[PDB]
Ligand binder design. Structure first.
Ligand SMILES: N=C(N)Nc1nc2ccccc2s1
Ligand SMILES: N=C(N)Nc1nc2ccccc2s1
Lengths: 202, 195
């Protein structure tokens, strides 16, 4: 008897939540978390303050869901760029994935939300857990494929993956906080080329 | 003097807090316990430290000073004959020093949480970036690393070294994790060193 009512209220709640996340991603992406209040976000999203209260305990809870949706888009955008790269070998896929990370992390919205705001708002523990949840699988599979092809030494995948994600996250943070980010991106790309080319047999 | 008495009170509290937080972690020991360990009244303690985080900020300074000194000592004693070998010795020194139980708990686990992102990174940079940039500069000068600005390489390598230490710190089998991580780090830097 009550399944349509329950599903209807679920769908309405989901639509409200999506509008708030979409609004918050847009305004915080342009001005930064510190500079935009939840009332402006509720106005942008076309929802009441009570609808906001119902969905999110507080401003940081809304930000935690923004980061989830952005990280899903970052991982999808990176997969698209590697897929489109023309990579002939697992080693070339790895190089395409590093290039994709510098391109996607360079998007001004990703820079603001993931590299500048997220470490501050989530705290160090929260940021590291999100980055590993989204990126460890892709990174490990790229390593497994290169090992299978004899382009990387046979070794435990997890330690290498975690160390490389540490290096790549700090590379992107360096570019994000540079006052001349075009020069920083060149210099950082050049470092990562030497690091990756030092490890790959191909 | 009044300044000497204040300094003695502060030293008792920083020593006590370093000992107790180093064993159980910041979250698990309150300021009353620390004041009892130090033999200091609550009022004398709050006169020197506004709150728990303030006391932790001074613990982090004395631990970072020991990390920096122990890193210098071990690299100096390694017998490294070239800048490339000093870099290799610094990698092994970092796994030895960061494996100290007090460093593991206070610097690797607690400091990023208590000080916050910006705070912890400012402290770490103040104590480390001197040694790090000198090691890199000497290797570039010797032609054992590519010609390049120092800072970008330093930040990327610090990201690898920090994640290596945190991997070991939370591992189910830290002795195994340290062997696996040492192999990864030595292979990463051997790919870039000419010598
Ligand atoms: N990682 C830290 N949080 N602190 C330090 N690391 C190092 C590493 C080498 C030399 C001095 C220092 S101080
Ligand atoms: N500064 C950091 N955030 N961490 C580290 N710096 C250094 C520098 C040299 C060796 C190990 C490490 S670990």
């Amino acid at each position: 008897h009550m399944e349509i009512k329950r599903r209807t209220q679920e769908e309405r709640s989901a639509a409200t939540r999506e509008a708030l996340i979409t609004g918050a991603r847009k305004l915080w992406g342009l001005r930064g978390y510190a500079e935009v209040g939840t009332p402006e976000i509720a106005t942008e999203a076309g929802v009441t303050r009570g609808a906001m209260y119902h969905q999110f305990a507080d401003k940081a809870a809304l930000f935690r869901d923004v980061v989830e949706v952005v990280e899903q888009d970052v991982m999808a955008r990176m997969a698209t760029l590697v897929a489109a790269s023309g990579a002939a070998t697992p080693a070339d896929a790895i190089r395409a994935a590093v290039d994709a990370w510098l391109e996607v992390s360079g998007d001004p919205e990703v820079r603001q939300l993931i590299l500048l705001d997220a470490p501050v708002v989530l705290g160090w523990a929260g940021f590291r857990d999100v980055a590993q949840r989204y990126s460890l699988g892709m990174t490990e599979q790229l390593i497994t494929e290169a090992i299978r092809a004899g382009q990387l030494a046979r070794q435990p995948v997890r330690p290498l993956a975690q160390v490389l994600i540490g290096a790549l996250d700090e590379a992107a943070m360096f570019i994000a906080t540079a006052d001349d980010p075009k020069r920083a991106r060149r210099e950082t790309r050049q470092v990562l080329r030497r690091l990756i080319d030092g490890m790959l047999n191909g």
